[PDB]
């Protein structure tokens, strides 16, 4: 039967063009809300038919593509806890109980999403020559899509809210944290503008259904398209555009209109509910969605109709959530971006506080500031030895042999020595930094590190006193070496013979005394 | 008398359905603000009576349920500092001074909340056949509820603002940090919309009380319901809906109205102040509350009346506070959610900075990036040994025996050994990771860790040279073992005999040299 | 921690007093961590400015 193993590469693209199907499926459900239109020629309420076949086709052509996922997790192994395994889990390709492994928790949420519930509402309407069913199609689309939002957004939640916590294919920039919470706005605006469109047509249907009864010579079947060849429609036809105009007109300047449309008067006064261009209607509703989600309903002037008020409350709450999520994921990105700079500024404020508290002389305060600025310019806050010590030992040894082998193999006692032990010497070379006019050593002081110069120029006088220069590649500290390999010394740090002043800003690699005894005790 | 001990389970449900009573009590006090209505039939100002009995009943049926709490902290013990105790405190069930322990600080704030102050305002109004008291009921409800807000919100402050700092029953998701600061909006909107309703009726009362004096043939007693059978009401009845209409009409299009209602003209022009449906009135006021708290008063067009201006200033300030709290608790949640991912991105930016500063070759830069991505894929930022070392020793030993016992009991010198000492060997097994084509050891190098393979496949050649494979469950590093248990070696790390290349990504458990001498010195 | 352990209030005042005094003097700054991250010549000159007259 070939029950699949869970880390197959075939179940890596069938979960790559699969979560894309779960993403594109919650964009198609709002397009069923643009199905009711108003035919302004006939003043009847109708259904867009080549948007009905379009949304039914594009939702079915995703859901039977989805039907090749519970027919494949049907063939699925899993991992179970055991101490027999040697490898963190058993794989069970036995088909007798993996069926229950799939169909005990994560089948019902995934089965209540491929159900063609908004496709059978469209079905018995478009297969008729009778206009009586415009009511039922508009009746059975708000709440079915509203309740199937929950299984369709719960089958994208583990693949988004935990693929943002531990992301898989992204590290480096802002193309999945800002460009995800900004397309979460564009999705929610797409859903909210479609609710606004559909509820705007329901309020216009309510107005027309109540203004037709007050006229008396009208049945509410006459307000729907396809009911023109009915008896009594001819006496209603000559009184349509006075009854529906004196009672159900929508203007944005009326403060006491005959019917209050509230937040839906912008939809009926602009005429997008009777728009023949779908680009105009979709763009106008999507922008209403984004404008009222972005501004938390601020500018909504609702009527005293409780479903409309509750729809406005939902917009305010959803916009508050969406805004808090966006600025919280942008602050989390920006704070992690400038973390070393803010650490440098905290460390810099601490040093000013400590030097003011201790009242250091200003020549000693300039030397502290100079070293801190130089260390920030070179390292940028990065602890290099902590980065190196967290690498594998082979990668450590290769990186350290790239950085420090030519420096150690210019010492004459180290170049002719070995390869075994100098590759243990250039694992303790740590980087030192020296600002200008820093005395690296002065005479009489114990030499406690050998320095192999990377960058910058130095100086050396001993006892106008036969000066000696030092530059990029040379070393300094050979008094420590001969002392350390000689066993006739003990722990006796030898005195310095030279005064070594940093002529420029210097980088070096330092080999301290106790790290030199360990490589001298390998004989 | 049975004075209770403070960690009884009976005083765990009598503080579970108790803080729910403290939460539901600050939702009932705004319902006294919807008591004044306008009877649009008679054009009189009245009182809703079956909302008066409803809010009085539902506040009394919470406060004498609350009266079984200071009758139970009456029977209460506490904990006092002493060094006699052995157990961090004395319990005092002596009833002579625990009364002062309750009634010295946290009795007055809790006693000034069960007071039926808004229930006695309702009392002498609904027990009469005279209309004269509509004034006093509306007079004594704004400031009494406004000043009893302070004891009723101070008896929920220690149980919310410190049960959010150290929560008791919640850990894992966003159902108490977003769904608490969003229902803090819905509470404040519930309070603010009720103030807006009540102050809107007070401004309409001011208009009517001043437009009745200007007519001259009217007493201000005539403006209240229940004063119809008074002398002179018949001459006022035929001039009501010209006097109160030319002087006290509320429209939203008038820019110079005869009376300025300001932020309260939306309440009187919509007609919710005379609404018979309480769902319409409550929803319309709650949405005004949420819309003007969410948008901080922006769309308020106040009059030049100072109490209304001060009410608007309070809305702007309260909305600023509520918004800062919501986005600050959402950023705190989201930042703690993606903490390991942001740590990985900081560590990843540091490595790029360091490899660019040191100018590593690109083959060495790919090996660093590959190991960091592999380590992030396996561990997800989690320091496993720090998690294990913070566990109890029995739990450590059981977890480590689950993870690492079958691996150690496949070594032939360890399987026949013991149980005592191999359970001390599998407490030092730490997890290693190897990317593909990583040389775990090469010949001539000192073997310094034994590796027990968890996952991935390996390779082994020695001196096309009789290759040897390694896979899930086998080990590698037996040259370290026989060296370490032999005392005829000293501290002499033996040379390698094989070249071991990771054929796949490998997990292992590593036993280093100095952790193997400690288990070899147990003989 | 002092509420959990139920310290006497004379021992709780001594803890609060030291913490307020340490915050007033150091302002959260770890001085020895600042000094130990300096170059050895700068360490020696700063420490000879701070502490030489006291030892001598």
Curated annotation (Swiss-Prot), chains A, B:
Q: Domain of life, per the record?
A: Eukaryota
Q: Where are the transmembrane segments?
A: 18-38, 52-72, 106-126, 140-160, 181-201, 307-327
Q: Which UniProt keywords apply?
A: Calmodulin-binding, cAMP, cAMP-binding, Cell membrane, cGMP, cGMP-binding, Ion channel, Ion transport, Ligand-gated ion channel, Membrane, Nucleotide-binding, Transmembrane, Transmembrane helix, Transport
Q: Which residues bind a nucleoside 3',5'-cyclic phosphate?
A: 413-523
Does this entry carry the keyword Transport?
A: yes
Q: A single GO molecular function, which one?
A: cAMP binding
- UniProt membrane topology term: Multi-pass membrane protein
- Segments on the Cytoplasmic side according to the record's topology features: 73-105, 161-180, 328-523
**Main role?**
Probable cyclic nucleotide-gated ion channel.
Oligomer status and interactors: Homotetramer or heterotetramer.
Family assignment? Belongs to the cyclic nucleotide-gated cation channel (TC 1.A.1.5) family.
Q: What is known of its domains?
A: The binding of calmodulin to the C-terminus might interfere with cyclic nucleotide binding and thus channel activation.
Which protein, by its recorded name, is this? Probable cyclic nucleotide-gated ion channel 5
